[PDB]
């Protein structure tokens, strides 16, 4: 018996809405992806399958583009893998757009396997492509994926026989865009895209009451507020430390729609996320382009040094409440404890939790790992009262946003354990 059911909006398409009573950390819908794949940055850092880094990964012989942590991945991935090997290796040098990959995947899993449970809800076929709002630039855009599609494939897939009847590539390529699942690792670092059709039924709202968190390619939704019965659910489609004029833009040009909620009609934070110097901070978020791709790219060192170029400038600085310096405290902080000088790392970590707990207000998984981190990071060096305090506001916040069937919560409580049997040593 599911919690949840889909239904027709008045006026945002389809929806998901509660069929039953829901209280915050209840879990909704539990999927693997219909299709998913490694995005550009993180190939060869983290198994194509898990989406775990290891140290070394080994390589599939054939194309020597997919690569695993381990023979039971590299095996396990094999039925999914079998038919792109093919294209990936004919296409050697070439590497396609994460979108193009992707889709492949969809196709083969659509053509040669059975029925999907991610797609239990509602499926690929019915996504909504947003077809008659794309702008031309857009569907330019469109048609070059559509010819790359064309490209990359051409080993396995040839005529419209070895698509699903009526498959549109056009239509396919705009359901992707604004239908697409940035897959999160534990540490909330980007490494993968997938596509989720039952969780497709989600809107968006800029202030949710549901929130999805990956342990791997699997994700989890959960309630983080309570729900009424028929009471409509909604998950947050962005990051959070975005304006209202940046959450539109990305909202119109992603998803096509114009959001009415609160928070959009009265630019709701949008001074304190913008205070200080405007100078300084268009300079900051002019580096935060590079500084996101090394980040995307697990380029530690180099994010390091150029965050400690801002957040320790000859020249004027910003609060850290501002939101493109508090982005720069938290790239400092990951490429720190990446690079193994804890110390510094807490530094940073501990700037970033009074903004954190203002622009992520409730429950929110970012928040959630962002406290687990400075705890542990308090832990390694020993302070155990400020760190089993830190823990435990993870965990008040990650029983809602993980729970129990995510791992990370196991990992937490080990750290909680850990922390408790220290104070109570005296
Ligand atoms: O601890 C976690 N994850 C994790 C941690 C917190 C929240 C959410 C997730 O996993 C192990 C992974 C191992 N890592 C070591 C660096 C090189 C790459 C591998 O990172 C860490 O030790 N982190 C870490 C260490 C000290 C303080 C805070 C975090
Ligand atoms: C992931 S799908 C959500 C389900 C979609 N309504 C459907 O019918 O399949 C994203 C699309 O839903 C619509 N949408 C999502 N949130 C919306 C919102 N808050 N207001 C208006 N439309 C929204 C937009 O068409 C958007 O591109
Ligand atoms: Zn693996
Ligand atoms: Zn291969
Ligand atoms: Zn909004």
Redesign the pocket.
């Known amino acids: 018996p599911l919690k949840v059911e889909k239904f027709a909006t008045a006026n945002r398409g389809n929806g998901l809405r509660a069929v039953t009573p829901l209280r915050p950390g209840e879990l909704l819908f539990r999927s693997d992806p219909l299709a998913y794949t490694v995005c550009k940055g993180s190939r060869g850092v983290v198994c194509d399958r898990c989406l775990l880094?290891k140290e070394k990964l080994m390589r599939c012989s054939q194309c020597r583009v997919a690569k695993y942590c381990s023979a039971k991945c590299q095996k396990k991935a094999w039925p999914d893998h079998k038919r792109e090997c093919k294209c990936l290796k004919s296409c050697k040098p070439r590497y396609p757009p994460d979108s193009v990959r992707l889709l492949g995947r969809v196709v083969f899993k659509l053509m040669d396997g059975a029925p999907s449970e991610s797609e239990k809800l509602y499926s690929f076929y019915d996504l909504e492509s947003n077809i008659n709002k794309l702008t031309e630039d857009r569907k330019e855009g469109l048609r070059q994926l559509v010819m790359t599609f064309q490209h990359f494939m051409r080993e396995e897939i040839q005529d419209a026989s070895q698509l699903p009847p009526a498959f549109d590539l056009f239509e396919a390529f705009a359901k992707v865009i604004c239908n697409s699942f940035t897959i999160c690792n534990?540490?909330?670092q980007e490494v993968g895209v997938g596509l989720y059709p039952s969780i497709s039924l989600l809107n968006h709202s800029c202030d949710p009451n549901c929130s999805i968190v990956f342990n791997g390619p699997h994700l989890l939704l959960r309630a983080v507020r309570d729900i009424e019965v028929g009471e409509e659910l909604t998950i947050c489609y962005l990051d959070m430390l975005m304006t209202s004029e940046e959450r539109r833009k990305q909202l119109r040009d992603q998803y096509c729609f114009e959001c009415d909620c609160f928070r959009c009609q009265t630019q709701d934070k949008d001074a304190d996320m913008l205070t200080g110097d405007e100078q300084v901070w268009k300079e900051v978020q002019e580096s935060l382009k590079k500084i996101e791709e090394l980040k995307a790219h697990w380029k530690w060192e180099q994010v390091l040094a150029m965050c400690q170029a801002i957040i320790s400038s000859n020249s004027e600085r910003l609060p850290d409440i501002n939101i493109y310096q508090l982005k720069v405290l938290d790239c400092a902080m990951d490429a720190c404890?990446?690079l193994?000088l804890?110390e510094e790392?807490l530094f940073y970590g501990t700037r970033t939790m009074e903004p954190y707990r203002i622009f992520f207000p409730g429950s929110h998984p970012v928040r959630g790992?962002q406290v687990?981190?400075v705890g542990?990071?308090q832990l390694?060096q020993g302070m155990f009262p400020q760190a089993m305090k830190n823990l435990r506001l993870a965990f008040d916040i990650m029983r809602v946003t993980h729970g129990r069937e995510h791992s990370?919560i196991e990992?937490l409580i080990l750290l909680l354990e850990e922390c408790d049997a220290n104070i109570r040593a005296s």
Do not use: Q, R, T, Y
């Open positions: 880094g534990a540490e909330m404890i990446n193994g804890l790392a790992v687990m981190k542990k990071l390694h990370l990992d």
